[PDB]
Structure 1
Amino acid sequence: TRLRIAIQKSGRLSKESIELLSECGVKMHIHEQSLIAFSTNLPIDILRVRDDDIPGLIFDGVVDLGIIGENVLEENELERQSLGENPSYKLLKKLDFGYCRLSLALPQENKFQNLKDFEGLRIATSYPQLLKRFMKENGINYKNCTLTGSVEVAPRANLADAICDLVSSGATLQANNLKEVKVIYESRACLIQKENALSKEKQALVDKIMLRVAGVMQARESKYIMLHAPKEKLDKIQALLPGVERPTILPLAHDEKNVALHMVSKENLFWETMEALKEEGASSILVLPIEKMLK
């Protein structure tokens, strides 16, 4: 009937998923406890489910789309493969949020020279397949300890000698006196689709959503810069701030000496050149938002 999208029930990843859908024009009036939501303007249903359950729903084709971390997706792919299955899906887009590293970590006091220091250790993780593959590949024997949450407390708790867990800022490792020693997997959120072909109408909607997703991602760190400069300085200013193609050049009232120039720029690059712009005579410099860009 309607296109079905599975998203995470909780975490920063869930909030960013809802925001992405909203920016892609999916209106939804969603109670905190509602597990199935129905878009009010598009034929789309949103299913809020535990992250670890999303890959299996996509593998089995009972939802159409999913937003999920690569780590969770591959963990579950490996699990299904280990049982003799052949899970498949389509990767539509690697997204610009949910960034993390799956890393081996040890108490700060422990001595680490190389990977062989994990030989024979109990290692606590929520990703036992990803860990198993890596340790097999490197020929390191270890004892697995599967924990669903609070993995960082396992060494202190004496449930394990070490951990393999997700790191973003590194604050959680530090708070628990752990040192990140080896990155085994890098992940971000991705948008995936079931393998079996959709109806023409559903696929057409996916295509429309994907155009907007690309628009959002393209605009993400970019702003629309406006400024005034002497006409004679056009070339110097263009060399510093080129725009996505070339500056727009706009007349100013009763002024034949100066113009307004407009350029799209990544914001951090703008700030890195702002003083040189002033040195070349730029004034009244404005930074405006861009919600979507299509190049």
Structure 2
Amino acid sequence: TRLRIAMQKSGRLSDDSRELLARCGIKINLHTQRLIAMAENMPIDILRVRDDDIPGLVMDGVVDLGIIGENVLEEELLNRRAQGEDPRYFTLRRLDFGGCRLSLATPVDEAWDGPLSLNGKRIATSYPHLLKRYLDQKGISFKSCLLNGSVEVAPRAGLADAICDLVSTGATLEANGLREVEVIYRSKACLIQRDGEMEESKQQLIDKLLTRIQGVIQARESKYIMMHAPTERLDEVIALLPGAERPTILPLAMHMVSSETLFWETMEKLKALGASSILVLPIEKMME
């Protein structure tokens, strides 16, 4: 049939996934209670499902493409491998959204001196396989304690010596007497392809879609920069701005496209280097 892409129906990645495909020129209605939507022009099926189920759909080839976050995907990969299976998939690419970090946390009123210290302790978590891979690699053994939510209760409840959980502002942990202490895994949403052989047409589309994804991401990361021919030191400038597609010089400045962001520190440097009237303009779309 036609192309089948799996995406989270409702949660942390849904708005962003919905948005990418639109931005890639994908007309489709998501204001519907229906879960398997046909795209209004391109021959594309979007299945709105639970994030938890995406890796597997992809690993069983029951869909061709999926948008899912690294942690979930990798957790389920290790799960099957621990059951003896050989799940297979192609990572087409890591995306520019969904960030999150999985971290070790311990009671605030206890000082920390590294992971070895956890040897023999009980750690609660929803990500048993990711935590085990990390400590194993580190030679540390531990007793797992499984919970699917509210993981932060574990310590103040006598369920564990410590926990491993998604953290961001760090609010919950403080409110639950714990503090971050080591990030063991950082994840982003990514785009994955099913295993096996792909037909000419749909693969042509997959290939096509990918490039539009690249452009959408570039455009939001990249910027158009305009300085001032600091003649001499002109060299040192370029090094702080990995343009990757050549500055343009003009007697009277410089005009170039930066893929990365101009953090204050970096501008702070340019300045002291003698650069004047530094400008950054947004780019709405780009094809390079």
CA separation of 1:264 and 1:115: change in aligned 2, threshold 3 A: closer
Alpha-carbon deviation of 1:287? 2.0
TM-score normalised by L of structure 2: 0.83
SS state of the match for residue 268, structure 1? Answer: coil
CA separation of 1:247 and 1:53: change in aligned 2, threshold 3 A: same
1:253 counterpart residue number? none
2:257 to 253, 264, 268: 264
Q: 4+ residue runs of structure 1 moved beyond 6 angstroms?
A: none
The answer (yes or no) to whether the contact 2:220–2:283 under 8 Å persists in 1 is no
How many residues are aligned here?
281
The answer (yes or no) to whether the contact 1:217–1:292 under 8 Å persists in 2 is no
1:35-79 Cα shifts (integer Å, max 9, x gaps): 222211211111122222111111100010011111111111111
2:180 counterpart residue number? 180
Alpha-carbon deviation of 1:273? 6.1
More strand by share: 1
TM-score normalised by L of structure 1: 0.81
2:285 counterpart residue number? 291
Alpha-carbon deviation of 1:19? 1.5
Identity of aligned residues (%): 55
Whose radius of gyration is greater, 1 or 2?
1
Structure 1 residue runs of 5 or longer lacking an equivalent are 250-256
1:21-45 Cα shifts (integer Å, max 9, x gaps): 1211112221264422221121111
1:218-258 Cα shifts (integer Å, max 9, x gaps): 2332222457x7xxx47469654776422275xxxxxxx94
How far apart, in 2, do the equivalents of 1:41 and 1:273 lie?
Answer: 48
**Equivalent position amino acid for 1:188 in 2:** K
**Equivalent position amino acid for 1:247 in 2:** T
**Equivalent position amino acid for 1:263 in 2:** M
SS state of the match for residue 29, structure 1? Answer: coil
1:30 counterpart residue number? 30
1:110-138 Cα shifts (integer Å, max 9, x gaps): 23223243233332111111223333444
Equivalent residue runs for 1:270-289 within 5 Å: 272=267, 276=271, 282=277, 287-289=281-283
The answer (yes or no) to whether the contact 1:223–1:290 under 8 Å persists in 2 is no
Structure 2 residue runs of 5 or longer lacking an equivalent are none
1:108 counterpart residue number? 108
Q: CA RMSD in A?
A: 3.0
SS state of the match for residue 152, structure 2? Answer: helix
**Equivalent position amino acid for 2:57 in 1:** L
The answer (yes or no) to whether the contact 2:103–2:182 under 8 Å persists in 1 is yes
Equivalent residue runs for 1:145-294 within 5 Å: 145-225=145-225, 233=229, 235=231, 240=237, 244-247=245-248, 258=252, 262-265=255-258, 266-268=260-262, 272=267, 276=271, 282=277, 287-294=281-288
SS state of the match for residue 282, structure 2? Answer: strand
Q: Judge which range, 77-86 or 96-105, deviates more.
A: 96-105
